Every structure is written in structure tokens, then in C-alpha cells.
């Protein structure tokens, strides 16, 4: 029943990741006693939501691994670059606002007449002979992966995805829903053979929309 | 003739001198290292452009030679930051992946840091361990250290200083002189006993006229 320091931290990280809408499952059993024994405060959804908000926006100086700022085992506050929120089943490298100097979340675009090296206003494809990166500029327009293993980078949180379907982006709640403005999807060509991305390619100052299936390898 | 590592350190030395971070350099044999390894000329124009592309208009990946896009620097396996280390001075410079750079009136204290009432300075003491940070908000107004060893952080480049006098900040040239918008000065109290920082404390509604009085921060 009693949870150790690392186990309680991993459960704390697991719930924070689920509120970020990065994972679809969680394991948060036993977190109430770990908080009231180490943190000393309640760990309800309000506590976490405020912690996520304070971390990604309105950040102030240093913090701790429990994502607490200040203007017993987590009182050292030797963290300002980034924080590695790792629950054991899914890891994420999240960057605080203290490192950055997120949009406030749309419309549906009309249809234009190929669905299968592209020419999209919303997509930027780069090929490094060293991998393939497909940067997107319209994060609300989704890019569903299929039979793929990617790592997506951003200015809010970097992490790797293998679940097929819609890409899960972090979403902060502070007077509304805040989503990143743009994210980049890197794909290792050397296991990713049958990887297919289905997206909506945008053609031009009115914009147009047509589906396309971009496959790598 | 200079080896690969030695040529890189001299390459870093010239970039550091152009950044106005160091006052001395060792660049003898650097042109031969460039035309033999880089394949391009290594004049002040070449370096100035490399500094320009690195700190502004940066786009994606680069190499330790500050080039963006047997050729030992064609793999472009470098992201995040670059450690410009010449052997005599190290600096962790971050690419964008800067202000453009007035006199304030005078007001009538001459010396703790718990209270300095400065609009230009934000003094924090981290009892969280053993360190003192004095954030500055007006980089043009200089803070001269005396008998001190600090490490200054910024959004352009982190490095440590021990030379007494004005703090040396990076300066990028692109249609003008660009300096960082704000820098942080950390001081480890646990060798840094005789440290004295002399700065211009800013005192005194939106209609408030701006004022200035000298102050000597003792640690
Ligand atoms: C975000 O947008 C919503 C739109 O209704 C608005 O109500 C809210 O105040 C905005 N929040 C911020 C922080 O801009
Ligand atoms: C991604 O999947 C969702 C859910 O089925 C779908 O509505 C959307 O159209 C897909 N993406 C594109 C670009 O079609
Ligand atoms: C700085 O001033 C110079 C000289 O007028 C100008 O060319 C340059 O665009 C300015 N840069 C910024 C960022 O204001
Ligand atoms: C620092 O040194 C310069 C040297 O010219 C001097 O003018 C200035 O008054 C000193 N103090 C400050 C706060 O800059």
C-alpha cells in the first residue's frame, strides 16, 4: 500500500501526463497518502491543473521535480532548464515558461481536387541523410499516423509516439484551452517501413484542403 | 600546423573575441585550418556572417563551425546549444533555432542586498542551498564587479567571469549592434568573500520620471 519516493513521483508524473492529454491510460492509486506524507498538500485535479498552468505559463524562476515554484524531500529546487516527466509507461521532456521568453484554442476549410516530396502550405518536409521530419504549422489540423514509430518535438514538450491514430498534443487549461502553435515530427528511416501519415494538405489568399497519404520508406 | 581540435579551439577563440567576451585571442594558423578542413576563407566577414546566422535567422541544425543548412563537419549532428570553448574561455551559446542598444537623471544610500529598491535589479537569495542571483533589467547600464568571481547566465550565452571591471556581454552585428535583453549574475557565497558590485540603482504612476543613484552591492 505504502509507496516509495520514486513510485509516488512516477504516479504524480503519470497523472500530470494524463491531464496533458498525452496518454490515454494512467495509474494513480495510492497518490493521496504519498502527497499528504511528502508534499503535505492535497493532490486533487485542482492542485495538478494549477501546477500544470504555473509550469507552462506564469512561470517564475526555479522549481522542483514536483513542479512547485517559490518566490520535505523536494526542497532543493535545482531545476530551471527542463523537467523530465516520466511515469514508467510514457516519458516526456517538458520545457517551462522560464525557458521560453502556446496559442489560445477551428474553422473547416473547403475541399479541392492527389491523395497519395509534397507541396502543402501547412506541411514542411525536410530529409536529413544523417531521418525525415514533417513539420506542421496547423496543429488543430490533425496528422494521423499508421504503423509508425515517431518522436515529436516542440517548445512545450518533446516525446515519442507509437500508438496509431491522432497525434496527442499537450493542452494546458488556463481561462481556456492552450495548445502548442506548431510541432515537428521526426521519423527514423532505419522499423518504420510501413509508416503512413494521413493528413489534409492545404493549397492556396483563400485556403483549400485535400486529403493525402504520405508514406515514408 | 594545427590539428583538428586545436584549430577548433582557435576557431572558438576568434568567435569569442568577436562576441566581445574576451579581450585576447590566439588565432595563429587559423586560416590554414579553414582552407584545409572547412574549405572556405576565414576572414572577419566569414566569421561575422557565422555569428549572424547563429544568433539570428537560425533555422534548424548546424555544426560546431557555426555553419547552417574530408569535410569533418558535414554531418550536422548538432542541435540545442553549442559549447564555444577556446581553452582559455568557455561559453555555452544557444541559437535562436536581442535588443538594438539614454541618460537618466540623478537622485540622492551608497551601499545589503536583501533590500536594494532597484527597478533595474532583482536580487534573490536562494536559501534553497547556497547561492545569490542579482537579475538585471537594463543591460546598457553596466554593473562593474570588483574582486569577484561570478557566473552570468542569459538567453544568448552562459559563461563565467572573473576579470574585474565592466561585465562583458555578447554583441552580434546585424544591421546594428544586438545585445541580450537581460542577464543573470549568480554568486556562490561558499572564495567570493571580497566581491563588490557597483551598479546604478533605479528609483522612481506611468507619469513617473525615471531616476538614477549609484549603489555598491556588498556580498
Ligand atoms: C482564451 O480564449 C477564450 C475564448 O473564449 C477567452 O475567453 C479567454 O479569456 C482566453 N484566455 C487567455 C488567457 O487569453
Ligand atoms: C484523423 O482521424 C480523425 C478521426 O477519425 C478524422 O476525423 C480526421 O479526418 C483524420 N485526419 C484527416 C487529415 O483526415
Ligand atoms: C536597429 O537600428 C538599426 C539602425 O537604424 C536598424 O537598421 C535595425 O533594423 C534596428 N534593429 C531593430 C531590431 O530595431
Ligand atoms: C563602471 O565603470 C565605468 C567605466 O567607464 C564607469 O563609467 C561607471 O561609472 C562604473 N559604474 C557603473 C555602475 O557602470
Author numbering:
A (entry chain A): 257 to 327, 345 to 374, 378 to 381, 385 to 392, 394 to 396, 401 to 414, 417 to 476, 479 to 492, ...
B (entry chain B): 258 to 326, 344 to 371, 378 to 381, 386 to 392, 394 to 396, 398 to 476, 479 to 492, 498 to 512
Question: Can you quote the paper on this entry?
Answer:
Crimean-Congo Hemorrhagic Fever Virus (CCHFV), a tick-borne virus from the Nairoviridae family, causes hemorrhagic fever and death in 5–40% of cases. The GPC includes two structural glycoproteins (GN and GC) and secreted glycoprotein 38 (GP38) containing proteins that also can be linked to a mucin-like domain (MLD) and one non-structural protein (Nsm). The role of GP38 in viral replication and pathogenesis is still being elucidated, but GP38 is essential in the maturation of CCHFV particles. Additional studies have observed that GP38 may be secreted or localized to the outside of infected cells and the viral envelope.
One X-ray structure of GP38 from IbAr10200 has been solved, which has given initial insight into its overall fold, but a GP38-antibody complex has yet to be described. As only one structure of GP38 had been previously solved and was from clade III CCHFV IbAr10200, a highly laboratory-passaged strain with little clinical relevance, we solved an additional structure of GP38 from Clade V CCHFV Hoti. This human isolate is one of the two that can be used to elicit human disease-like symptoms in a non-human primate model. In addition, CCHFV Hoti has a 15% sequence identity difference with that of the IbAr10200 isolate that might reveal any major differences in tertiary structures or surface composition between CCHFV GP38s. Crystals of the CCHFV Hoti GP38 were readily obtained, and the structure was solved to a resolution of 3.2 Å. Both the structures of GP38 originating from the IbAr10200 and Hoti strains followed the same global fold. However, an additional alpha helix is detected between Hoti GP38 beta strands 2 and 3 near the N-glycosylation sites. Also, a divergent loop conformation is observed in amino acid region 490–500, and like the IbAr10200 structure no electron density for the amino acid region 330–345.
